[PDB]
Structure 1
Amino acid sequence: DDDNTEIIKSFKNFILEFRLDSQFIYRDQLRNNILVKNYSLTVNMEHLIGYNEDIYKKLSDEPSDIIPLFETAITQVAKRISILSRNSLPTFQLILNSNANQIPLRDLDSEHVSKIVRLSGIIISTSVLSSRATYLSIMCRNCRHTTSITINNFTVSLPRSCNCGPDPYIIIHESSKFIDQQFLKLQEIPELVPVGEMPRNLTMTCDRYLTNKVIPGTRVTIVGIYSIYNSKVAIRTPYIKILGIQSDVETSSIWNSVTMFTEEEEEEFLQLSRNPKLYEILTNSIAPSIFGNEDIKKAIVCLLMGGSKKILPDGMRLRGDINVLLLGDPGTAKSQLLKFVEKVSPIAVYTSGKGSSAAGLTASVQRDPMTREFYLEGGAMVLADGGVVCIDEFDKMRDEDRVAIHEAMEQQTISIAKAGITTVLNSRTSVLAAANPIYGRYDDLKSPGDNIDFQTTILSRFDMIFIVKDDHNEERDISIANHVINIHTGNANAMQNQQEENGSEISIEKMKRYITYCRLKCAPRLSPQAAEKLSSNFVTIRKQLLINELESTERPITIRQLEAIIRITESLAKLELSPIAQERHVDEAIRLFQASTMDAAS
């Protein structure tokens, strides 16, 4: 251990001595974080390999036996930094990341066990916070000898030495110190390497300042260490202890959230607002794939920003942002489109169901068959809260909680009174309906309504409803057909978009950060007269659709339709980053739903 103490000196050396010209980065970082009460430091393994190779060669060999030692010195480092003596100072956390070298999950077996592995995968579900020991002490049940154990990481049962026997010790719970542990359940990336099979989930565990760092269902990178423990031959459960974890780009986001700030954003986000093309250049962000369909193309944008959400007392609150329908003949690009749309969302879930992929479209509470006691299992809508709703096959959605969609879209909630739990839980999720209409183009010579299940009311529940009609028509094709062979090889259209990147167009991983950005600032609002304009526009929309109904035609319009078009205003306005909205500003939102009014006229 004095060998380990020489290693201790080696790391104290490592910190005090190291230089990037000229400040000692970790050293600054310490006194920086001690007032953060971070009590942790993120160290490049490359500044380490650059400092002394030796210590890594032995670190990479049995890091488990060293990582705590590495901390016992830097926790001492704070002692020689934080304050001078001649409290209480918590035992440090360390989080180390490195560029390293990526390894795929399916190939992880034996071998590399008990070493470092950088890798990504994606988390499925977060385990509840579980607190674990840091310090504990004990008096003897018989001789009353006072023991003090420092419980360190990374099982180990309590030592019995002062009948006395066999092991007469019970924890002094009053004086003990503690830490949280996460128990990540995380899954391999969707792309590799499923081969034919199902995606694996390998279990890992956070602690301290690592906890709650990562959302359920977001792409992430963990480094950690591959290890095993029994957990009822020898057949012990595979797992990875976690150091250090870093979000895949960004992800940051959560919570409240982040910028941070990198000032060039405000300017670059304001210049966007000074670009008259910005609304439309967002439209040109959405489909490098899809040439044309500019209408619905303008329709996607306004959703993601979030629309008006105003909470006015009493508890009455109106939703945002809205709903959209991609229903139309196959060839619409709407699934390809949607597979753009979800990748655009900062946080969302792609549902072609039924519900996705295996998800109860609404959270279905299911008993833990072990230790009984129903617990809510989460849901696609639930996890997608404050994010996009993706729906295919909406012709086929679960009929019982189809209504929970009929509800959650509107009341921004789902009430579960089932079993024990009565909690009404938030889905503020904004739906985009991509289903294929009954019989394709055959509902066009028929009543276009009742197309969606057996009721027209679903349309009212939705907002921006759009029927995409592609006739086989000339030259609108020959140009997109021309667009095609370019799109494929050699991405002759995907190069042509990179000079529009330099000339005009957005990068769209940017578009995430844009829509994340302007959704966290307070809700935009129209001046009075555009609203009264919504009044004389709609009095004629409604007038028109009673007069249209002079033929006794069954149908379509509501008073949530006018309001629907309202939210589109604050959407398109939230583009502007402006607390107000101009008359014409609102007006192209009007022309934007105006096609849906003729969808009512067809």
Structure 2
Amino acid sequence: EIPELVPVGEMPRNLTMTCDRYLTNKVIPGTRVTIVGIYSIYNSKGVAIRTPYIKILGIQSDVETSSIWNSVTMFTEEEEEEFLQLSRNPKLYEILTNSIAPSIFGNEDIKKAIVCLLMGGSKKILPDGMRLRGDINVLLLGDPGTAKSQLLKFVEKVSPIAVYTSGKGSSAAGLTASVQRDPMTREFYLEGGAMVLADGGVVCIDEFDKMRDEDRVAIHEAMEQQTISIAKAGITTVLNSRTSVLAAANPIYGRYDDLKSPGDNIDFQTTILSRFDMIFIVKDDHNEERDISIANHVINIHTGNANAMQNQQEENGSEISIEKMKRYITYCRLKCAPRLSPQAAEKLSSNFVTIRKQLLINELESTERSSIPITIRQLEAIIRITESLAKLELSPIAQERHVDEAIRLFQASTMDAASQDPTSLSEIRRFEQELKRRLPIGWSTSYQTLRREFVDTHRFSQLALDKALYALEKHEYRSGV
């Protein structure tokens, strides 16, 4: 009964219906429908009371959403033509970027990553028994109260192919698919869990950190295989899991704690991080001027008089009817699948091994192995490039490598904020302090001392002096004036 009606304190009553051959199977459960059918009564087998039901003469969708898209273009050639025109115009990429997460005040590269993930990485089926894994799951780490859960909810509202959930709200057993005993069959049947629903959909879930870890281990395997293999209770069913999971974990003590050891920071096991293949950070912005500007934005969206003008400003140019954004996203993920690396090949042949070499650089800065967390990051990154080029789709069209380079840079520094040390930046800060404790008082000045000690620092230069300057640079005519 009418989820909007919300009868206060009344359990929602349900009535049975019947459909005819040209009415049956039109709509799925969990979808609202405006019905026109005769009120109907029959005896279930309590005096003179009989089962109330409805015999339907017409079916209309209250949700109004079209049925399972069988590629029949209700948008027709016209709407998809302007969709391609938006793909033709590279500026529309930033339009979609800005439009996502209204009132967020920035985080544009984050929104770009979100758009790319929602866009769907292409699953390639090799002639071998293997098959390239298309979808990816993005990890959300950072300080609380930073619209992260808000952004997750917004994204899920944008794309209903999956369902927003929360860790505690989702049953710990069978998160992907729970096993339940049917009332009329004592056998525990397989009930579709969230990632069954999330399969074929980009899914956002809350409170990853708050969730018990043990079953979250069962999630990484399912997303890795893109299926869900169950042999529990003597039932060997395997169900596909084509989903893009958006994490929600405030790493430790709420805040991101970037200036602390990643093991302390990331309560999740680093194997889970690698298997989910994505990494991301929300840090403390500071920037009191930017904080002022954020306050302006938040009040503007908060006060209806101002809210309206930002609403129309976003709508005319950028927010462009979020619903038909979702429609275009469906059409253009249909446009993903045809080809995702025509323009890549030549430039990627260099940049792939390039990023591999920067990963080698990273292990060079992370001598002593910097503990377990940093070792597998190179492997998750090499898989990350392969999946993330498809994630970026070639952009709306044919712009894969030139932006994937920047995105890989963003991820590299993302991990470096946590992979610089096993206290993280605090240890290199201590290193640059125990460096500078001689620089002014001794250690000569003006690179002459660097030309003097260790015989022009040559032995010190390759590793020790590089570690020195990497710590020094942060504390030590184009933008200001």
Bin of the TM-score, shorter chain as denominator length: 0.7 to 0.9
Return closer, same or farther for 1:500/1:597 CA change in 2, 3 Å cut-off.
Answer: closer
Q: Deviations over 1:563-585 (max 9, x none)?
A: 86777788777877889744654
Return closer, same or farther for 1:203/1:315 CA change in 2, 3 Å cut-off.
Answer: farther
Return closer, same or farther for 1:355/1:205 CA change in 2, 3 Å cut-off.
Answer: farther
SS in 1 for 2:73: coil
Which whole-Å CA distance do the structure 2 matches of 1:482 and 1:405 have between them?
A: 40
Q: Deviations over 1:318-374 (max 9, x none)?
A: 323201122211122111101101111132111112344899522112222424333
Q: TM-score, normalised by structure 2?
A: 0.74
- Contact 1:486-1:493 within 8 A present in 2 as well: yes
Which whole-Å CA distance do the structure 2 matches of 1:554 and 1:234 have between them?
A: 82
Return closer, same or farther for 1:587/1:304 CA change in 2, 3 Å cut-off.
Answer: closer
Q: TM-score, normalised by structure 1?
A: 0.61
Deviation of 1:288 after TM superposition, in Å, equals 1.7
Which whole-Å CA distance do the structure 1 matches of 2:78 and 2:300 have between them?
A: 35
- Contact 2:256-2:265 within 8 A present in 1 as well: no
Deviation of 1:432 after TM superposition, in Å, equals 0.7
Return closer, same or farther for 1:286/1:267 CA change in 2, 3 Å cut-off.
Answer: same
- Contact 1:569-1:585 within 8 A present in 2 as well: no
SS in 1 for 2:264: coil
Which whole-Å CA distance do the structure 2 matches of 1:540 and 1:590 have between them?
A: 14
Deviation of 1:231 after TM superposition, in Å, equals 3.1
Structure 2: gaps (5+ residues) = 419-481
Q: Which structure is higher in RCO with an 8 Å CA cutoff and minimum separation 6?
A: 2
Deviation of 1:377 after TM superposition, in Å, equals 1.7
Return closer, same or farther for 1:574/1:382 CA change in 2, 3 Å cut-off.
Answer: closer
Greater percentage in helix: 2
- Contact 1:347-1:384 within 8 A present in 2 as well: yes
Deviation of 1:271 after TM superposition, in Å, equals 1.3
Return closer, same or farther for 1:365/1:584 CA change in 2, 3 Å cut-off.
Answer: closer
Which whole-Å CA distance do the structure 2 matches of 1:516 and 1:285 have between them?
A: 17
Deviation of 1:558 after TM superposition, in Å, equals 7.7
The 5 A counterparts of 1:437-456 are 437-441=251-255, 443-449=257-263, 451-453=265-267, 455-456=269-270
- Contact 2:161-2:198 within 8 A present in 1 as well: yes
Deviation of 1:253 after TM superposition, in Å, equals 4.5
- Find the structure with the greater CA-based Rg: 1
Return closer, same or farther for 1:593/1:530 CA change in 2, 3 Å cut-off.
Answer: farther
- Contact 2:201-2:242 within 8 A present in 1 as well: yes
Which whole-Å CA distance do the structure 2 matches of 1:539 and 1:220 have between them?
A: 53
- Contact 1:328-1:467 within 8 A present in 2 as well: yes
2:182 aligns with one of 342, 364, 368 = 368
- Contact 2:394-2:400 within 8 A present in 1 as well: no
Return closer, same or farther for 1:360/1:193 CA change in 2, 3 Å cut-off.
Answer: farther
Question: How many residues are paired up?
Answer: 414
- Contact 2:142-2:281 within 8 A present in 1 as well: yes
Which whole-Å CA distance do the structure 2 matches of 1:193 and 1:200 have between them?
A: 11
SS in 1 for 2:16: strand
Q: Deviations over 1:503-538 (max 9, x none)?
A: 454211111101111223461545478457556556
Q: Deviations over 1:538-563 (max 9, x none)?
A: 65655555554457668866889778
Counterpart of 1:586?
403
Which whole-Å CA distance do the structure 1 matches of 2:378 and 2:33 have between them?
A: 40
Which whole-Å CA distance do the structure 1 matches of 2:264 and 2:86 have between them?
A: 42
Which whole-Å CA distance do the structure 2 matches of 1:458 and 1:433 have between them?
A: 12
Q: Deviations over 1:391-414 (max 9, x none)?
A: 111113354532331112111111
Deviation of 1:220 after TM superposition, in Å, equals 3.5
Q: Deviations over 1:81-129 (max 9, x none)?
A: xxxxxxxxxxxxxxxxxxxxxxxxxxxxxxxxxxxxxxxxxxxxxxxxx
Which whole-Å CA distance do the structure 2 matches of 1:511 and 1:391 have between them?
A: 22
SS in 2 for 1:553: coil
Deviation of 1:466 after TM superposition, in Å, equals 0.8
Counterpart of 1:459?
273
Which whole-Å CA distance do the structure 1 matches of 2:284 and 2:358 have between them?
A: 26
**Worse-superposed segment, 234-243 or 316-325:** 234-243
- Contact 1:288-1:494 within 8 A present in 2 as well: no
Structure 1: gaps (5+ residues) = 1-187
Deviation of 1:283 after TM superposition, in Å, equals 1.0
Deviation of 1:193 after TM superposition, in Å, equals 0.5
Counterpart of 1:576?
393
- Contact 1:437-1:452 within 8 A present in 2 as well: yes
Q: Deviations over 1:291-339 (max 9, x none)?
A: 2121211111111221121011223123232011222111221111011
Q: Deviations over 1:440-461 (max 9, x none)?
A: 3363222224644452111112
RMSD across aligned C-alpha pairs, in angstroms? Answer: 3.5
